[PDB]
C-alpha cells in the first residue's frame, strides 16, 4: 500500500489559473497526514522560489522537499541529496543564451540570478507566478557560479540547438516558456529514490501526481501515478490514473479513488 506522496506544485497543488491551492487539496492532505502517509514536495522550483506553499506548510503537513527537478533534495534541514552542472556546460549554456538574446535564471545552493531579464521573464515569473523579483548578475559572473539548476528562457526549437553543448544535464518543463537545466540523471524520479531511501520506503508503495513534462519521470517511476485533468496527453499517458482538473478537485477525488484517503 501506498506510504509516501509526491507532489508536484504549480498545476498539482497550486492552480494556474487560481494562483491558490483548493481548499478540497488542504483538506485531502490534512486526511492523509492523519492516516499516516508521508508527504513530499517534488518541484522545478528552487527552495528560494517556493512562496506559494504556506497553507500545507502552516499545517506542518509536508514531510520533505525534491527541489530543483531532484537537484536539491531535503528532510527538515538535512539535505539528504544534491548535485552541480558541470561548469562547462554552464558556461555554454550562458554564452548561449546572451549570444541569443534570452534570459536565464541561475541557481545556487543558497543564491539565485537572472542574466539579462527581459518580457518572458517579468510576464511569467513576477506577474503570473507570482515570483519575487529575483536579482541580476551579469552572464559573465553566472557563468563562473557553482550552479545546481539553471532556467533558460528557450524555445523547444532554440533548445535543439542548444543541446550539443548541454551534453549531459538533463531538461524538463514545467511551463512552456522556459527550461529547467540539470546534472546528469538529477529528475525527480532521482529525487523520490533519495526520499524513500531515507524514509525505508520501497518505490512499490510511492505514488506521485503531476500536470507536466518534468512530472513524466515520477508519474512512470512511482507505483502509481496520477495526471491531473488539464494535462497534456503525454503527461496523461505517463500516468497510471488521470483525476480530475485541479479546480474540480483532481486531487481530492484521486486520493479518494485509491483509498489513501
Ligand atoms: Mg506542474
Same mark, same amino acid.
Given at each position: 500500500?501506498?506510504?509516501?506522496?509526491?507532489?508536484?506544485?504549480?498545476?498539482?497543488?497550486?492552480?494556474?489559473?487560481?494562483?491558490?491551492?483548493?481548499?478540497?487539496?488542504?483538506?485531502?492532505?490534512?486526511?492523509?497526514?492523519?492516516?499516516?502517509?508521508?508527504?513530499?514536495?517534488?518541484?522545478?522550483?528552487?527552495?528560494?522560489?517556493?512562496?506559494?506553499?504556506?497553507?500545507?506548510?502552516?499545517?506542518?503537513?509536508?514531510?520533505?522537499?525534491?527541489?530543483?527537478?531532484?537537484?536539491?533534495?531535503?528532510?527538515?534541514?538535512?539535505?539528504?541529496?544534491?548535485?552541480?552542472?558541470?561548469?562547462?556546460?554552464?558556461?555554454?549554456?550562458?554564452?548561449?543564451?546572451?549570444?541569443?538574446?534570452?534570459?536565464?535564471?541561475?541557481?545556487?545552493?543558497?543564491?539565485?540570478?537572472?542574466?539579462?531579464?527581459?518580457?518572458?521573464?517579468?510576464?511569467?515569473?513576477?506577474?503570473?507566478?507570482?515570483?519575487?523579483?529575483?536579482?541580476?548578475?551579469?552572464?559573465?559572473?553566472?557563468?563562473?557560479?557553482?550552479?545546481?539548476?539553471?532556467?533558460?528562457?528557450?524555445?523547444?526549437?532554440?533548445?535543439?540547438?542548444?543541446?550539443?553543448?548541454?551534453?549531459?544535464?538533463?531538461?524538463?518543463?514545467?511551463?512552456? *516558456?522556459?527550461? =529547467? /537545466?540539470? !546534472?546528469?540523471? $538529477?529528475?525527480?524520479?532521482?529525487? @523520490? +529514490? &533519495?526520499?524513500?531511501?531515507?524514509?525505508?520506503?520501497?518505490?512499490?508503495?510511492?505514488?506521485?501526481?503531476?500536470?507536466?513534462?518534468?512530472?513524466?519521470?515520477?508519474?512512470?517511476?512511482?507505483?502509481?501515478?496520477?495526471?491531473?485533468?488539464? *494535462?497534456?496527453? =503525454? /503527461?496523461? !499517458?505517463?500516468? $497510471?490514473?488521470?483525476?480530475?482538473? @485541479? +479546480? &474540480?478537485?483532481?486531487?481530492?477525488?484521486?486520493?479518494?479513488?485509491?483509498?489513501?484517503?
Amino acid at each position: 500500500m501506498t506510504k509516501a506522496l509526491f507532489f508536484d506544485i504549480d498545476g498539482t497543488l497550486v492552480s494556474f489559473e487560481t494562483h491558490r491551492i483548493p481548499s478540497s487539496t488542504i483538506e485531502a492532505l490534512e486526511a492523509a497526514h492523519a492516516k499516516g502517509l508521508k508527504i513530499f514536495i517534488a518541484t522545478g522550483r528552487p527552495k528560494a522560489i517556493i512562496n506559494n506553499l504556506s497553507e500545507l506548510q502552516d499545517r506542518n503537513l509536508i514531510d520533505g522537499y525534491i527541489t530543483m527537478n531532484g537537484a536539491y533534495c531535503f528532510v527538515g534541514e538535512e539535505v539528504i541529496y544534491k548535485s552541480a552542472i558541470p561548469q562547462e556546460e554552464v558556461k555554454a549554456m550562458a554564452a548561449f543564451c546572451e549570444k541569443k538574446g534570452v534570459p536565464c535564471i541561475f541557481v545556487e545552493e543558497h543564491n539565485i540570478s537572472v542574466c539579462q531579464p527581459n518580457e518572458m521573464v517579468k510576464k511569467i515569473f513576477y506577474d503570473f507566478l507570482h515570483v519575487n523579483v529575483i536579482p541580476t548578475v551579469s552572464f559573465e559572473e553566472a557563468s563562473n557560479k557553482e550552479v545546481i539548476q539553471m532556467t533558460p528562457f528557450i524555445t523547444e526549437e532554440e533548445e535543439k540547438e542548444v543541446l550539443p553543448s548541454i551534453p549531459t544535464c538533463e531538461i524538463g518543463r514545467w511551463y512552456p *516558456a522556459f527550461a =529547467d /537545466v540539470t !546534472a546528469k540523471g $538529477d529528475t525527480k524520479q532521482k529525487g @523520490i +529514490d &533519495e526520499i524513500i531511501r531515507h524514509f525505508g520506503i520501497k518505490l512499490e508503495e510511492t505514488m506521485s501526481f503531476g500536470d507536466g513534462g518534468n512530472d513524466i519521470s515520477m508519474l512512470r517511476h512511482a507505483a502509481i501515478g496520477v495526471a491531473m485533468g488539464q *494535462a497534456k496527453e =503525454d /503527461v496523461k !499517458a505517463a500516468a $497510471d490514473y488521470v483525476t480530475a482538473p @485541479i +479546480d &474540480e478537485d483532481g486531487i481530492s477525488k484521486a486520493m479518494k479513488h485509491f483509498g489513501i484517503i
